[PDB]
Amino acid sequence: MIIIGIDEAGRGPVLGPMVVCAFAIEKEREEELKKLGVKDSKELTKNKRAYLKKLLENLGYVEKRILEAEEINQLMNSINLNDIEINAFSKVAKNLIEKLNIRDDEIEIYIDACSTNTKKFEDSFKDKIEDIIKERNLNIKIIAEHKADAKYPVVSAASIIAKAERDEIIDYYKKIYGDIGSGYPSDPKTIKFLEDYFKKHKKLPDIARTHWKTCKRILDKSKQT
Amino acid sequence: MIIIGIDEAGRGPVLGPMVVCAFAIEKEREEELKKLGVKELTKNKRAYLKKLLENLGYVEKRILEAEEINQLMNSINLNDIEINAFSKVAKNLIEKLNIRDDEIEIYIDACSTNTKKFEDSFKDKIEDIIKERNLNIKIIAEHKADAKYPVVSAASIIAKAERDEIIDYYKKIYGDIGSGYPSDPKTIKFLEDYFKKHKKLPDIARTHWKTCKRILDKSKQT
Known part of the structure; x- marks a missing residue:
């Protein structure tokens, strides 16, 4: 089966974009992902994160969603940040499942709850993808928890990639x-x-x-x- | 026996470093190397292969920044620098791995025009350290060796990846x-x-x- 980790970067700053990433790989290649050393602390430097991203992208399937401040401002004219996150997390999940055309199989999705209501986040997420799951005859297992990028490799990978992507965009803002x-x-x-x-x-x-x-x-x- | 491939990256450019790499592995484990299909690629897949390769075999690297290149060329030429750097990584492997009472096959990707002479100078360079190790050393150098021998393709992949990291950074x-x-x-x-x-x-x-x-x-x- 396929194992997917989803996380985001940039939720806290008052400027710049937010990046949402879903990282997927065959469960059988899990030891390979651990070997890459994603099992590292969240104390990585920008350069190391950039390096890791290169290796990670070569190893798994990477789906990305970048929301610049202008889109975030627009969306917030109607919905709040928690809704945006729920929508973006579910959209990269559905997009990755559709692009890899996953169906008639088991699947596991690990998501990092970055907000204050873990259960609400997870229930909303499943509500958003329930249609596609059933439509594709997938037997899913969803796991949501705080600091998930510290305990599930694929979420750690998603996190590193999302932050590296954000770093790239920010670096050019300086110019x-x-x-x-x-x-x-x-x-x-x-x-x-x-x-x-x-x-x-x-x-x-x-x-x-x-x-x-x-x-x-x-x-x-x-x-x- | 031990199989060693030696190649380099950045021989031709007017800027940046020259990287010389020697990749060594037990011939018994050579299939673990061929399984990677090492014999162009994205900088991502190459960085990936470089990590796998440095975990798979014994990798000895020498990086010459332009400053050192310039200084050395005040007395010797580029072909001489290559003889030294190539022989030096080979001597380090022999010594660090403490190879002795064994057979060794060294494959060299030779860019210089006179390959046999390069080979002889290389041989002359490692003579001293191997004299008392009872080694049966076979040296084979030729053009485009990275396209023929897996251990040489490995070294080439590694040296180019090393050079890219440095050059891609300079671009900032x-x-x-x-x-x-x-x-x-x-x-x-x-x-x-x-x-x-x-x-x-x-x-x-x-x-x-x-x-x-x-x-x-x-x-x-x-």
Whole structure:
């Protein structure tokens, strides 16, 4: 059977994209994945993650979904972040199952619940893919839990790939905006970037997520007085 | 017996490092190597094969950055450098693996024009370390050996992958530098551009290559 891990990267920053990745492989090639050393701590450097991605992509089937801040802002005009995650996680799952044309077999999906309601996340996920599962006569096993990229290899692979992809996009933003920092408000470089940018253009830059506190607060303040 | 393949990457470019690699494996386990079908590929699949290969056999590597190349060429030529680097990785394998009272077959991918002479110089280089190891050493060098012998294809795959890691990274400190060869207008460009702005050649440029020697002569300084 096929074993699939799904995770995401970039959920926390006030800027940049979110990347959702599903990583699938034959359960029989599982020892091969472990040997690749994905069983590493989440303390990897950007360079090491980039290296690992190359090996991982050669080993399994990789489905990716990149949501730039502009799409995230648009979607959030109607649905919240948790819905976006549920939708994106289910979409890469269904897309990977359809592209590999998996059917009439067992299948296992491991997902990393990055939000506060693990059970809600898993139940929503299964509700989204139930149609395709039954339609394809698949006998699925779904497992959702926090910090899953720390315990299930395929989820670890999905995580590393999603973060490496995000790193690539962010690296090029620097050529457009300069040193934008880590993307978190704990970094003066990121605060300086957004504040200085807004002061000059009277609008947030295209990569800013309008619904994150840091950015909303900047907008709320511009409207005072 | 022990089978060893020796190849290199980056012999021709006007920039970047030269990588020499020697891959060794027990002949009894050679099928574990052929099973990989080592005898072009993406930089992804190659990086993958390199990891599998370094786990499969004994891999000895020598990386010569342009700076070292330039310094060495102030006294010896490129063919001489290859004799030294190729013989050195072979001596290290023999010594580190402590091979003795055994048969060894060394396959060399030889780019130089006079292969038999390269072979003799190589042989002359390892004479001292093998004299008292009671080894039956068979040396075979030829052009395009990486297309004929699995152990040589392995070394070639590894050396190219090593060179790519270094070169692909440079593309972030200099931007698109081209292929490293003169044909690539971005290579012959990146050099001229750096020279006009810096008044010197970039550190990764090989000073003795025609393109670089020419750039240096135009200013008529040297």
